[PDB]
Design a protein around this ligand. Structure first.
Ligand SMILES: N=C(NO)NCC[C@H](N)C(=O)O
Ligand SMILES: N=C(NO)NCC[C@H](N)C(=O)O
Ligand SMILES: N=C(NO)NCC[C@H](N)C(=O)O
Ligand SMILES: [Mn+2]
Ligand SMILES: [Mn+2]
Ligand SMILES: [Mn+2]
Ligand SMILES: [Mn+2]
Ligand SMILES: [Mn+2]
Ligand SMILES: [Mn+2]
Lengths: 313, 313, 313
């Protein structure tokens, strides 16, 4: 459909700084051009200027709470605008803590949205269950209504308001979940397909079940938050926390081709691309190239081929 | 069954020259010996001496039309002979434009043949839809009856006569199809399993459907045209146009083991192996070794093991 | 459950010596610590001191028969003890010939055990069918009751007594089976899932069928003999006889996660890890790291996550 690109050069949700270059390398790879090369109407809303917050000491164990909270607050506003302009928001990250603002802004315009979270992690730790203190591993806890009451008043997030229920989200690709996160998973009855379920059923059945689970009762807007470390590091090595045994390039493209075909993609996040972590220049291009491929699939690029509504013969 | 090896050291169907060494490196890898090590009766018809055609300017955008057309005409003759000798033709390429002659010669003796095309590409561009002008991306358009009338009179192909119908061919492995090619696919109702279908159904279901689609009504001779770039470049890197997200080594062996089990393999093509494109000596041996493995599976080599009709205990 | 670690630094079942360092590198990787980090009660029975047998000339073609036979005899005793102590035996190899002693000792305490053999090889050659003479490719022939009578009196194995029937074992991962071995497979009706069956059905169906085949009639103790070369060499390169087209990291973890869930794991073997064969230091850590991952899955480590029986919120 119509696209609204939003750059989110933010890294304070985790320790490694290079992730704020994600928007830069993705654009430099010709993402806007490639999208236009397709039947896509693209409007670049530019990179959000995330002001520096010098005074931002930890809230207990949680690091850079004000910087993270403000960045998501700013992003939520931009996403809500692009959604109001009738465009599918495409947020280029940036660490995953930004999901808080992206999904929040998306839900302001489309409260009935459903979320598909592709990631090796659940990122559902609360400020009290986290052991790392990195906010990119907590975005989901801030968004779930069932958890409001388990989230302390962390500086920078007073603007947040839980917008989704445990049943409005599906996880795909999980392979490194913390104990508390697993407890929340089972306690709230969240639907997930860890790498174990992908191995058992095959990605085809996984997507069939995912889309049926989220669109069964009725059709609703879909928000896809894609963490590049959800895919195996043999495809996306330049990322902060890679975990072996990931989703293949093919599975990544399958997930997105299927989501595109629903015609319900409403919001998209391409997160955790960190060029500074590429062991080689090739590891960087390999990661960025895969990230672009996944993005293009979300907007119609199909492996069986594509053609214009004309008679080619 | 009984085998008839035919070397086709030809490269003019595309730009990179090293592909004409395919027969050489495949034989040097001990292909004939390995085949004989099995219950295989092998006769080497040698490498076809493709005469040089100095005067061969492009037909519009199409390059080396006379060289390509003549090479396929010569090959068609050799294949028809080996088929008449009651042997399964094994053509070692060489670029894929040779498929025109291999399938044409095969159909002269067995007009009811069915084709399984393993490739990342459909190679069904016509001389008028192609944008590259490389004939290795057009062989199928010359063979389909439904397209006769959309193929101009290109110098070197006046001998061609469409021998198969849209319904006599199945594609497996597609992941880089041109717009016009996709239009032809949908327009003629051609059966295909792109990498998307392989991901969705699994290679087992894909082969079950492929063989049922082609052998359902009745048993008929099978022609397998195997383009090595159909497999992922992590297995066959030394090829002209590699595309990531390909068929795995295992899937390649599965396809061929299943085709062998039909007992209907009649013609085989092992194409696009280009040693000159191996970034390293290991990339070359890796490509050639995989090509040999695929070939041996076509003739009985099974992963579960093989044994003679004797009492080993 | 409760674990009993047994080190088996033995290599004489094959030619390459570095495999006797397996216990060392696996322990150095923190296996005991990692296991304890889980709900696991671990007791290290140390490394069995395999005395040197200077006089050990070949029995016909069979090499180091006395050294191999004695090593398995010693291991059988240790395994029987750990089993009597109510612990799941975890044997760190060492070449696979040790399976003779591990399964023999296990069956002394649990005669109704069932065996799942993960390997690229069947290791079911008899002293008379083998062409290599390496005993690590014959362990299964010594254990099968149906073959007692086809096994000559080899020096060092007079203590052996066939403890399992052809129907008490299932193979997974086969891709390099000798002719005689295949003859035995078909002759005795042994249940196997070669890489061809894994491709056809998917690992989920494979495990479903495997566990149903072995636990259908009734629940019984399970012995898992895991040869690391069962997995693709892209995951476990430091091994004596690697064969491409192997089980993936994910499939390896799936097999073991499923076996763990049965709650019937009784005996485990982690064999063929040879650090000396790692082309690089990274190939060594890659092999050892994968071996540890497989082991941890056998004892509860799940990809969807794990959590204590407490309220994390
Ligand atoms: N990159 C990620 N998630 O996507 N890291 C999260 C890791 C860990 N679970 C935490 O809370 O710190
Ligand atoms: N190697 C191949 N096909 O197998 N190249 C074909 C590419 C392109 N579709 C063309 O017509 O030029
Ligand atoms: N590493 C192994 N098996 O696990 N080698 C066995 C090879 C061969 N089948 C033999 O009997 O020598
Ligand atoms: Mn992640
Ligand atoms: Mn994440
Ligand atoms: Mn191709
Ligand atoms: Mn081709
Ligand atoms: Mn083995
Ligand atoms: Mn073995």
């Amino acid at each position: 459909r119509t696209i609204g690109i939003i750059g989110a050069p933010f890294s304070k949700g985790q320790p490694r700084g290079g992730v704020e270059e994600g928007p830069t390398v993705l654009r430099k790879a010709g993402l806007l051009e490639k999208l236009k090369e397709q039947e896509c109407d693209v409007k670049d809303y530019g990179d959000l200027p995330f002001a520096d917050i010098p005074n931002d000491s930890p809230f207990q164990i949680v690091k850079n709470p004000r910087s993270v909270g403000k960045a998501s607050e700013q992003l939520a506003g931009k996403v809500a605008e692009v959604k109001k302009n009738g465009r599918i928001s495409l947020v280029l990250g940036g660490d995953h803590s930004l999901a808080i603002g992206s999904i929040s802004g998306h839900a302001r315009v489309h409260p009935d949205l459903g979320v598909i979270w592709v990631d090796a992690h659940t990122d559902i730790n609360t400020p009290l269950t986290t052991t790392s203190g990195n906010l990119h591993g907590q975005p989901v806890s801030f968004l779930l209504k069932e958890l409001k009451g388990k989230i302390p008043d962390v500086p920078g997030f007073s603007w947040v308001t839980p917008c989704i229920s445990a049943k409005d989200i599906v996880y795909i690709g999980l392979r490194d979940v913390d104990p508390g996160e697993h407890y929340i998973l089972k306690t709230l009855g969240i639907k997930y397909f860890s790498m174990t379920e992908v191995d058992r059923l095959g990605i085809g059945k996984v997507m069939e079940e995912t889309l049926s689970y989220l669109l069964g009762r009725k059709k609703r807007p879909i928000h896809l938050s894609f963490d590049v470390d959800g895919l195996d590091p043999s495809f996306t090595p330049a990322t902060g926390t890679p975990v072996v045994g990931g989703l293949t390039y093919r599975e990544g493209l399958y997930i997105t081709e299927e989501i595109y075909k629903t015609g319900l993609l409403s919001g998209l996040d391409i997160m955790e691309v960190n060029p500074s972590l590429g062991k080689t220049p090739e590891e960087v291009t390999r990661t960025v190239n895969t990230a672009v491929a996944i993005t293009l699939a979300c907007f119609g690029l199909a492996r069986e081929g594509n053609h214009k509504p004309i008679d080619y013969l």
